[PDB]
Amino acid sequence: ELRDQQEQVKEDMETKCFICGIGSDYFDTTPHGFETHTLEEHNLANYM
Amino acid sequence: KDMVVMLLSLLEGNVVNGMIARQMVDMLVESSSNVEMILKFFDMFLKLKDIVGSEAFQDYVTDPRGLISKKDFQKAMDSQKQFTGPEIQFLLSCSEADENEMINFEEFANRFQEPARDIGFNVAVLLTNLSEHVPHDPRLRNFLELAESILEYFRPYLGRIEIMGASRRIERIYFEISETNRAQWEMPQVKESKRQFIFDVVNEGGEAEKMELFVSFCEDTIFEMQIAAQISEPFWGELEVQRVKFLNYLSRNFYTLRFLALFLAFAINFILLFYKVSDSPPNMVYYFLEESTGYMEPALWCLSLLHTLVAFLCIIGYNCLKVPLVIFKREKELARKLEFDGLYITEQPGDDDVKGQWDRLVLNTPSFPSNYWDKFVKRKVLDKHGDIFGRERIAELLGMDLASLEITAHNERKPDPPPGLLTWLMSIDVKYQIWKFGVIFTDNSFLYLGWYMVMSLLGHYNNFFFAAHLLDIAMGVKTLRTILSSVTHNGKQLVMTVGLLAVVVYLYTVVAFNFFRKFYNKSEDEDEPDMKCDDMMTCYLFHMYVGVRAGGGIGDEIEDPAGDEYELYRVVFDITFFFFVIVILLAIIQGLIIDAFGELRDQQEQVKEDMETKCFICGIGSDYFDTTPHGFETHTLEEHNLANYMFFLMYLINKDETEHTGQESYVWKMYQERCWDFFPAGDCFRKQYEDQLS
Amino acid sequence: MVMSLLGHYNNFFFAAHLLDIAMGVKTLRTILSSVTHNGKQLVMTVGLLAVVVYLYTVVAFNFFRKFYNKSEDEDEPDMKCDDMMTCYLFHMYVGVRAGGGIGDEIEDPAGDEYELYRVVFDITFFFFVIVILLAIIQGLIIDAFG
Amino acid sequence: GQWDRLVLNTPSFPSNYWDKFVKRKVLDKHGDIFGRERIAELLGMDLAS
Ligand SMILES: CCCCCCCC/C=C/CCCCCCCC(=O)O[C@@H](COC(=O)CCCCCCCCCCCCCCCCC)COP(=O)([O-])OCC[N+](C)(C)C
Ligand SMILES: CCCCCCCC/C=C/CCCCCCCC(=O)O[C@@H](COC(=O)CCCCCCCCCCCCCCCCC)COP(=O)([O-])OCC[N+](C)(C)C
Ligand SMILES: CCCCCCCC/C=C/CCCCCCCC(=O)O[C@@H](COC(=O)CCCCCCCCCCCCCCCCC)COP(=O)([O-])OCC[N+](C)(C)C
Ligand SMILES: CCCCCCCC/C=C/CCCCCCCC(=O)O[C@@H](COC(=O)CCCCCCCCCCCCCCCCC)COP(=O)([O-])OCC[N+](C)(C)C
Ligand SMILES: Nc1ncnc2c1ncn2[C@@H]1O[C@H](COP(=O)(O)OP(=O)(O)OP(=O)(O)O)[C@@H](O)[C@H]1O
Ligand SMILES: Nc1ncnc2c1ncn2[C@@H]1O[C@H](COP(=O)(O)OP(=O)(O)OP(=O)(O)O)[C@@H](O)[C@H]1O
Ligand SMILES: Cn1c(=O)c2c(ncn2C)n(C)c1=O
Ligand SMILES: [Ca+2]
Ligand SMILES: [Zn+2]
Ligand SMILES: [Zn+2]
């Protein structure tokens, strides 16, 4: 039970945006789209 | 072929239903009779090649010399029901029948196979390119049907990949896969490396590094193919040719020697089961074999020497087969950090990276890129960091002679390479060898082989040391290694819970020493008591030795607590030690092992699921491709096959740069610049032309 | 059928037929499938168990033989580790089946020069064989159910 | 595969399989490239019949 909680948290962060909630599949239409979205567009650190 | 290459150049950057592509189809239709005649030339001799090798044809061949008469040839061909009347007559005219009408069908079949191969492949590429870009032209299927044999023959060699071209669109590239490249790719060792690589990137890899890791895998695979080719098999000169043959034999049979050493270890240990210790010679005792055959004692000596020899050959087999890859990989990563990062120019690792600090010895060595293919890395680094860091300082760091750069570019010198051993002594780069040996001595696989050899030598001092070799079954059999991985997966947790077990037992010891000492008399004697808890160190050892191993905990070992003032306190001590140590803490140790089995199992399932649900190259799911029947299967075998990208890289390296096409030059330039934007990511040819294709 | 005919020679052979419940009842077959699913792994870990016990036997024959006297008699000793084959059988027979490992069966290591060495031998054999290797056998069966 | 060679030339090879003309179909498909008489010998077929 504890192991899957770590896996679930890791999976959610790498499959959905923490801010908008849109999945990585939509952003991956553009090469490295999800990586750029989570580092430039909806980076949670920038909101801080 | 040159005309077809020109036609293929007109199709560069051609969209589906493009005007150039449709014009080319009209040109083929306008000359359909000539195109059919050309296609009928290729298939007739391709069919003739397989007919002469057929069993039915050999039944007609009666001449012992291996010839066949024209009349016999005439009745042989029409019995195959593959050629028509005029076609057989044309084949008879092409056959160089002598004055006796005898035909050498062996040379006849092979006469045009080689000269017409290059043009035949390009025609197949041209028809394939037109078919996939003009898929709704009824006039083009006729040519495809007439060229079915040509397309079938060149199917294993017609490699196709999809790239993101400079025009910001997905383009499909057709190239040639040589027989040797495909044969080397299908070797079991290469296939095993591919499976290991696929598992690593899918399990513990990221999407941003996926393509860079894939290219690094391609570079390593190409290097391994060269090693396999070198070791393959079809007074200084006399010994050198035998020395390389002996080394290649060890390299080819490295795994058989590893199996042989394991087999010899069991044979030695089987004999060791007959050892017997006796005071009488065969107050010190004597260890001797106890057997009636009388052959086991000489056999043990022979096997011990043979096992030592095999273990020594494994080290030689390893350093000639696996070490070159280790050096190649380390030189590869070091060269890129020198150029694309300036590891020893700008950052200067902070002494906490032993790998980085050890590589400083090879920077100025004259033979630094010994295994890495790029022999001009120093030249490239000088041009990139010379202006900002100092050309003379860069040359000193890399051991480069600036005055020698021009003279090499001016002309070439041909010195005398005297084949003497004395001249070979000072030609050895001692500093490079020291660096190389340090890398080998830090390799886990080499150190294991070295331990196996040391233990084999110790076996000569006492034969019982040959027992250690039976551990090799840990990596000798992959089934045991997977089982043992279920123990080492949570090894750190297993160590900590044992340490936690020691602490909880110490707390029980402190309580016992302070309050329950009277109950620790382990002597049935009445006048000399063996008190086990009169010292903390003794009492702690007692709890750790007999307390943990006891089924019911410490209570089983210590005296009964009945009719005593502290009976209730002692029942809590005994029940709590049973629960916390015997029940809970041992369940944690077993729980970690059981959880590891599940964790390792799902990793295999996750890797298998990802490969069968997403494309390794573009990442698009199988659901999208399955709109078209068997769409994902065709996409992963024809459109975005990862093996074709391996072949395309090998195709570019072998092909001359002046002969590169526009698409090939675009990919080749980005390979040298380490830019992986040509790999399709999230897009494919089918998706780009959904409206046109459907 | 062959076992039924052998049953006529000795009726006790009719016992073998009671095994049929393995496939006679589908519930048992599913349960037994949880054992045969990782059967190859179960065979290998038993083979690994035999190898680890052999290594313990080699150490015992070489250094700890005095502690393997399994005779309460005083003039005729029943030394269990005077031969490698006998000592290996002793470890595989009573050592594996013992709850606390080999230490329970062999003589106490107290007041001896090799006491600390013998405590490491006894605790490591308890951990590696009784605890870890038996957990693997049970872990394989549990994982098969999942 | 090696055990099935005994049934190739048997007169009643497709006893349970519904296709009773498998030998006829195989002869028409591989007879030209492998030899009609050799295929008939392999499958135990009488060409004159
Ligand atoms: C120590 C084992 C190292 C690996 C452990 C894993 C194996 C598990 C158990 C294996 C069983 C070992 C056999 C023990 C019985 C040997 C009894 C014996 O001969 O005991 C020896 C002790 O001598 C020694 O200790 C020599 C060995 C040198 C140091 C031993 C340590 C091994 C070094 C390991 C090398 C690298 C290790 C690093 C990696 C860590 C492990 C991966 C005495 O003789 P003997 O005089 O009367 O006769 C000789 C006959 N004449 C004297 C007449 C000629
Ligand atoms: C009195 C009841 C307190 C017991 C509560 C137990 C709760 C947990 C406490 C554990 C330590 C107990 C120490 C009590 C402090 C002193 C008590 C006292 O007044 O001491 C009482 C005696 O009462 C007792 O006998 C208490 C017996 C305690 C037995 C409890 C068994 C539980 C064992 C738990 C082991 C801990 C490991 C936990 C690991 C966690 C893993 C999950 C009178 O002295 P004293 O004039 O004869 O001179 C002290 C003796 N010296 C001269 C040596 C100093
Ligand atoms: C051996 C069992 C094979 C299957 C094992 C699985 C079953 C597990 C255990 C079953 C219990 C078996 C009963 C043992 C008690 C029998 C005592 C006895 O009668 O012992 C017999 C021994 O004789 C035999 O051994 C005969 C049997 C022939 C060989 C036995 C091997 C069985 C062959 C198996 C066939 C295929 C096996 C291959 C598949 C592998 C297994 C799936 C002696 O008599 P008895 O003279 O004094 O009297 C007879 C009375 N009068 C003599 C006066 C008439
Ligand atoms: C000296 C300390 C070394 C002990 C380190 C133990 C680490 C692992 C080693 C295991 C084998 C130990 C052999 C030591 C080599 C010789 C030592 C020596 O110098 O030998 C010392 C004696 O010291 C000792 O007593 C060492 C006792 C070792 C006990 C260690 C218990 C650990 C058991 C581990 C079992 C391995 C199974 C692992 C399975 C893995 C599963 C995960 C003096 O000789 P010797 O003049 O009387 O003549 C040798 C006797 N013969 C005449 C017969 C040759
Ligand atoms: N809005 C978001 N902002 C940041 N990260 C996001 C967001 N949505 C999803 N993520 C994911 O969160 C993951 C965690 O971020 P990342 O690992 O890059 O952080 P870091 O600051 O480098 O350090 P650390 O590894 O400790 O988290 C990223 O890989 C990213 O895919
Ligand atoms: N780009 C890709 N290239 C190749 N295979 C891919 C790709 N994307 C996904 N796959 C999947 O990878 C799986 C593994 O390939 P496959 O099993 O056919 O390889 P193989 O060479 O026949 O041998 P092996 O069974 O050892 O892998 C395929 O079934 C396929 O669905
Ligand atoms: C010459 N050469 C290259 O140029 C090359 C390569 N891998 C990538 N490149 C770019 N290999 C293996 C290679 O031999
Ligand atoms: Ca050109
Ligand atoms: Zn977002
Ligand atoms: Zn793809």
Side-chain angles (χ1 to χ4, degrees):
Chain A
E1 172 61 30
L2 295 179
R3 181 170 56 89
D4 60 60
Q5 289 184 356
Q6 312 298 329
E7 300 177 357
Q8 184 63 32
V9 170
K10 184 180 62 60
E11 184 71 17
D12 292 330
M13 294 303 298
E14 307 302 325
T15 51
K16 297 188 307 301
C17 178
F18 185 83
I19 300 298
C20 66
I22 303 179
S24 301
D25 51 356
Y26 171 78
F27 296 111
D28 286 329
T29 303
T30 299
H32 302 69
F34 184 73
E35 178 65 26
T36 58
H37 179 77
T38 58
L39 259 62
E40 303 176 357
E41 303 177 6
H42 290 181
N43 195 327
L44 62 91
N46 288 13
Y47 288 93
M48 166 81 63
Chain B
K1 172 191 174 182
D2 297 323
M3 188 187 64
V4 177
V5 169
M6 182 194 64
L7 294 179
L8 294 176
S9 300
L10 286 171
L11 300 179
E12 291 187 0
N14 175 261
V15 301
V16 176
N17 300 326
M19 61 93 61
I20 294 183
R22 287 187 284 99
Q23 278 182 313
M24 188 171 301
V25 176
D26 301 331
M27 180 269 300
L28 295 183
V29 173
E30 187 179 8
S31 60
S32 59
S33 301
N34 305 322
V35 172
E36 296 173 358
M37 192 178 303
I38 294 179
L39 294 179
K40 200 57 184 180
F41 182 89
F42 295 147
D43 61 358
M44 276 173 55
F45 292 105
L46 288 181
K47 288 163 56 182
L48 179 63
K49 177 59 179 299
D50 56 71
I51 282 186
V52 299
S54 179
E55 295 79 8
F57 183 83
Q58 296 293 337
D59 296 357
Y60 290 89
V61 178
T62 60
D63 195 309
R65 300 168 299 178
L67 308 182
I68 177 176
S69 66
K70 298 183 59 179
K71 281 75 57 184
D72 188 20
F73 192 86
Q74 169 67 239
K75 62 173 55 59
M77 304 312 292
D78 55 3
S79 179
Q80 306 291 323
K81 278 75 181 180
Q82 284 191 326
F83 297 101
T84 69
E87 298 173 18
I88 296 179
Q89 299 299 322
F90 178 76
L91 290 177
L92 288 173
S93 59
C94 295
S95 59
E96 302 297 330
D98 64 334
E99 68 285 348
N100 302 122
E101 282 73 25
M102 305 306 294
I103 301 179
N104 190 330
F105 61 93
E106 291 82 347
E107 63 90 12
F108 185 29
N110 313 335
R111 190 185 308 171
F112 309 102
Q113 290 301 298
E114 180 64 27
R117 192 185 189 278
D118 53 354
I119 174 60
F121 175 79
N122 289 270
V123 172
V125 171
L126 179 63
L127 297 181
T128 302
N129 197 324
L130 291 179
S131 61
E132 298 180 358
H133 291 69
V134 193
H136 299 339
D137 199 322
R139 305 170 302 176
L140 194 54
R141 297 94 188 262
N142 180 30
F143 295 143
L144 299 177
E145 295 160 354
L146 294 171
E148 178 269 351
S149 60
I150 295 93
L151 293 177
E152 178 64 29
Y153 178 82
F154 292 109
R155 169 164 291 103
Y157 315 114
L158 201 158
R160 50 171 75 89
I161 66 171
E162 298 179 6
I163 69 156
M164 173 65 69
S167 59
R168 304 299 302 110
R169 298 196 313 268
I170 292 295
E171 302 178 357
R172 186 166 295 178
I173 298 183
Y174 305 90
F175 64 98
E176 179 180 353
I177 306 176
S178 64
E179 297 78 11
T180 61
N181 294 343
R182 178 166 293 275
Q184 293 173 343
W185 174 254
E186 297 297 333
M187 300 306 295
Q189 56 276 13
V190 181
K191 300 181 64 60
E192 177 62 29
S193 301
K194 182 192 65 178
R195 302 188 191 96
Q196 182 62 31
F197 159 78
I198 292 300
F199 174 81
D200 297 332
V201 292
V202 173
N203 189 23
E204 53 267 355
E207 56 89 14
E209 203 73 12
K210 188 179 186 181
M211 285 311 181
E212 184 172 355
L213 291 178
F214 174 70
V215 177
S216 64
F217 166 76
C218 295
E219 299 179 354
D220 299 359
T221 304
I222 294 177
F223 182 73
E224 291 306 286
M225 292 179 179
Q226 302 179 2
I227 295 183
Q230 291 179 8
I231 66 179
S232 180
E233 295 290 340
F235 68 100
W236 290 271
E238 190 274 343
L239 61 89
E240 281 292 336
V241 61
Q242 298 300 140
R243 186 186 68 92
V244 295
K245 185 263 177 183
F246 179 73
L247 264 56
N248 292 335
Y249 179 82
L250 269 56
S251 302
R252 280 185 285 100
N253 305 117
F254 171 76
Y255 291 100
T256 65
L257 293 178
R258 285 292 296 164
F259 163 78
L260 185 62
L262 182 60
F263 171 81
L264 265 53
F266 278 94
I268 293 179
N269 289 275
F270 176 81
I271 297 181
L272 263 53
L273 282 175
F274 293 79
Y275 252 91
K276 179 181 181 61
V277 52
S278 178
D279 48 68
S280 178
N283 56 272
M284 52 88 59
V285 294
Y286 298 85
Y287 290 75
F288 59 88
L289 285 176
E290 191 273 327
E291 47 83 20
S292 60
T293 304
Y295 295 154
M296 290 178 48
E297 183 71 33
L300 180 60
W301 187 80
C302 297
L303 291 179
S304 60
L305 269 65
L306 189 59
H307 179 266
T308 298
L309 178 63
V310 174
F312 182 71
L313 297 182
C314 291
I315 297 183
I316 300 183
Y318 178 86
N319 94 304
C320 298
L321 179 65
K322 301 295 182 58
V323 157
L325 180 55
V326 180
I327 304 303
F328 172 86
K329 295 178 62 60
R330 193 182 179 100
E331 290 182 359
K332 174 185 62 178
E333 51 88 14
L334 178 57
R336 307 184 192 281
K337 292 189 301 181
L338 280 177
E339 177 178 359
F340 301 94
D341 295 323
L343 187 67
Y344 302 96
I345 294 92
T346 59
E347 39 263 29
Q348 290 289 343
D351 202 10
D352 289 330
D353 196 336
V354 57
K355 188 178 188 304
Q357 296 296 330
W358 180 255
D359 295 333
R360 314 183 72 96
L361 305 180
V362 81
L363 298 181
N364 58 332
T365 52
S367 60
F368 155 67
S370 299
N371 292 17
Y372 191 49
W373 50 268
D374 197 338
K375 309 301 180 182
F376 311 98
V377 47
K378 294 183 179 179
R379 322 282 269 94
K380 296 166 60 180
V381 173
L382 175 61
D383 300 332
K384 185 176 182 180
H385 302 268
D387 299 330
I388 196 61
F389 198 73
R391 291 179 53 88
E392 62 282 353
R393 178 153 48 253
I394 290 295
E396 175 268 354
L397 178 62
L398 302 179
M400 305 175 59
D401 195 332
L402 296 182
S404 299
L405 301 180
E406 293 78 10
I407 57 178
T408 54
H410 294 4
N411 201 328
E412 183 62 30
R413 302 301 126 181
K414 258 68 67 179
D416 177 70
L421 295 184
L422 177 59
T423 63
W424 181 84
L425 204 281
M426 66 285 301
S427 65
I428 299 179
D429 190 5
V430 48
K431 196 174 185 181
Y432 179 83
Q433 300 298 329
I434 297 180
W435 172 86
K436 185 177 66 61
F437 286 154
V439 183
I440 301 177
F441 292 154
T442 52
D443 190 7
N444 297 330
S445 300
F446 174 84
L447 280 176
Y448 182 74
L449 291 190
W451 164 88
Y452 200 96
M453 165 95 280
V454 159
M455 296 303 298
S456 194
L457 290 175
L458 270 173
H460 292 294
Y461 186 82
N462 196 4
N463 301 338
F464 280 108
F465 283 112
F466 281 116
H469 302 100
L470 276 202
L471 282 175
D472 194 26
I473 66 175
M475 52 189 301
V477 181
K478 76 281 303 180
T479 305
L480 283 177
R481 192 160 63 259
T482 58
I483 294 180
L484 290 183
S485 65
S486 180
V487 182
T488 61
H489 185 70
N490 297 329
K492 188 175 184 59
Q493 284 72 229
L494 286 177
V495 175
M496 296 306 296
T497 184
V498 171
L500 177 62
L501 171 60
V503 167
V504 305
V505 164
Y506 176 76
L507 290 173
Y508 278 98
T509 303
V510 166
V511 175
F513 187 67
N514 289 288
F515 308 108
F516 300 130
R517 275 181 5 249
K518 4 148 23 148
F519 296 115
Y520 287 68
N521 194 340
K522 295 298 298 300
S523 179
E524 65 282 352
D525 174 290
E526 306 299 329
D527 58 18
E528 42 106 7
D530 186 9
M531 303 302 296
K532 285 294 182 179
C533 205
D534 283 0
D535 195 320
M536 275 293 303
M537 199 169 304
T538 301
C539 200
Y540 180 63
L541 180 61
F542 183 80
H543 287 73
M544 284 289 299
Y545 182 57
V546 312
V548 180
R549 301 187 302 103
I554 200 59
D556 281 0
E557 323 289 290
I558 52 192
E559 202 212 7
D560 219 61
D564 190 71
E565 80 283 329
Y566 281 167
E567 167 152 19
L568 261 219
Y569 288 123
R570 162 93 181 282
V571 315
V572 176
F573 180 81
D574 295 349
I575 269 149
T576 59
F577 184 100
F578 171 76
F579 274 106
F580 301 150
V581 167
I582 306 302
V583 175
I584 288 180
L585 281 183
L586 297 187
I588 298 179
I589 298 181
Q590 300 181 356
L592 289 170
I593 300 179
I594 297 178
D595 190 15
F597 279 112
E599 172 61 30
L600 295 179
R601 181 170 56 89
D602 60 60
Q603 289 184 356
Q604 312 298 329
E605 300 177 357
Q606 184 63 32
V607 170
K608 184 180 62 60
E609 184 71 17
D610 292 330
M611 294 303 298
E612 307 303 325
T613 51
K614 297 188 307 301
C615 178
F616 185 83
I617 300 298
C618 66
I620 303 179
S622 301
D623 51 356
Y624 171 78
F625 296 111
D626 286 329
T627 303
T628 299
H630 302 70
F632 184 73
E633 178 65 26
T634 58
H635 179 78
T636 58
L637 259 62
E638 303 176 357
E639 303 177 6
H640 290 181
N641 195 327
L642 62 91
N644 288 13
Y645 288 93
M646 166 81 63
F647 293 139
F648 187 70
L649 176 57
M650 308 179 67
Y651 173 78
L652 293 181
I653 299 171
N654 175 83
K655 195 176 187 181
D656 194 312
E657 294 191 10
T658 59
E659 301 296 331
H660 286 173
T661 69
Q663 306 167 348
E664 297 172 359
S665 300
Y666 176 80
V667 180
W668 181 246
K669 185 176 186 297
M670 303 230 294
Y671 259 106
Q672 300 175 331
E673 297 180 354
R674 303 285 293 178
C675 179
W676 320 122
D677 294 359
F678 61 93
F679 284 109
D683 195 2
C684 62
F685 182 87
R686 186 182 307 180
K687 181 170 296 185
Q688 184 168 244
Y689 300 103
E690 279 295 333
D691 305 332
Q692 290 75 32
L693 292 179
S694 61
Chain C
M1 165 95 280
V2 160
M3 296 303 298
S4 194
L5 290 175
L6 270 173
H8 293 294
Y9 186 82
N10 196 4
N11 301 338
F12 281 108
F13 283 112
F14 281 116
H17 302 100
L18 276 202
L19 282 175
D20 194 26
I21 66 175
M23 52 189 301
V25 181
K26 76 281 303 180
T27 305
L28 283 177
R29 192 160 63 259
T30 58
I31 294 180
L32 290 183
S33 65
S34 180
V35 182
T36 61
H37 185 70
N38 297 329
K40 188 175 184 59
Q41 284 72 229
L42 286 177
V43 175
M44 296 306 297
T45 184
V46 171
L48 177 62
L49 171 60
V51 167
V52 305
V53 164
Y54 177 76
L55 290 173
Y56 278 98
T57 303
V58 166
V59 175
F61 187 67
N62 289 288
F63 308 108
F64 300 130
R65 275 181 5 249
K66 4 148 23 149
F67 296 115
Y68 287 68
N69 194 340
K70 295 298 298 300
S71 179
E72 65 282 352
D73 174 290
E74 306 299 329
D75 58 18
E76 42 106 7
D78 186 9
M79 303 302 296
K80 285 294 182 179
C81 205
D82 283 0
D83 195 320
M84 275 293 303
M85 199 169 304
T86 301
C87 200
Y88 180 63
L89 180 61
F90 183 80
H91 287 73
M92 284 289 299
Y93 182 57
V94 312
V96 180
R97 301 187 302 103
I102 200 59
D104 281 0
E105 323 289 290
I106 52 192
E107 202 212 7
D108 219 61
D112 190 71
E113 80 283 329
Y114 281 167
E115 167 152 19
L116 261 219
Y117 288 123
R118 162 93 181 282
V119 315
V120 176
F121 180 81
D122 295 349
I123 269 149
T124 59
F125 184 100
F126 171 76
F127 274 106
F128 301 150
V129 167
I130 306 302
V131 175
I132 288 180
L133 281 183
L134 297 187
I136 298 179
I137 298 181
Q138 300 181 356
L140 289 170
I141 300 179
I142 297 178
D143 190 15
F145 279 112
Chain D
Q2 296 296 330
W3 180 255
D4 295 333
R5 314 183 72 96
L6 305 180
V7 81
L8 298 181
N9 58 332
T10 52
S12 60
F13 155 67
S15 299
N16 292 17
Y17 191 49
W18 50 268
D19 197 338
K20 309 301 180 182
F21 311 98
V22 47
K23 294 183 179 179
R24 322 282 269 94
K25 296 166 60 180
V26 173
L27 175 61
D28 300 331
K29 185 176 182 180
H30 302 268
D32 299 330
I33 196 61
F34 198 73
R36 291 179 53 88
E37 62 282 353
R38 178 153 48 253
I39 290 295
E41 175 268 354
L42 178 62
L43 302 179
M45 305 175 59
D46 195 332
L47 296 182
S49 299

